[PDB]
Amino acid sequence: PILKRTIISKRKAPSNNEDEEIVKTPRKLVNYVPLKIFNLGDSFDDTITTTVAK
Amino acid sequence: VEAQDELQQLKEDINSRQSKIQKYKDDTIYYEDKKKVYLENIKKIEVN
Numbered sequence: 564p565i566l567k568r569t570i571i572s573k574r575k576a577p578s579n580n581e582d583e584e585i586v587k588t589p590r591k592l593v594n595y596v597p598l599k600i601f602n603l604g605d606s607f608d609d610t611i612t613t614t615v616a617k
Numbered sequence: 618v619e620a621q622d623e624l625q626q627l628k629e630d631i632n633s634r635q636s637k638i639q640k641y642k643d644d645t646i647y648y649e650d651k652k653k654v655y656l657e658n659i660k661k662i663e664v665n
Binding site for chain 1 (some may be wrong): 641661662665
């Protein structure tokens with residue numbers, strides 16, 4: 564009823580989440596920038612628990 | 618007349634060939650510039 568319609572999202576409510584710029588923004592020919600030092604995880608520190616394991 | 622015609626056609630052909638050599642040198646300079654850009658990209662990839 565009202566709950567289902569409020570929970571559901573109308574496809575017309577937004578502009579189909581349109582992106583910025585008519586076409587995709589240009590990028591550098593290499594532009595690798597690997598980074599990715601941490602992939603998720605993190606949270607509790609490893610050094611303290613490693614000392615706890617020792 | 619045959620020798621004159623052969624000389625004129627050879628002279629035109631060799632002038633065109635020399636101009637072809639100079640344009641090939643320009644193309645090789647452009648290729649060397651592209652190779653230098655590629656080497657700069659390779660150095661950036663290597664530092665990354």
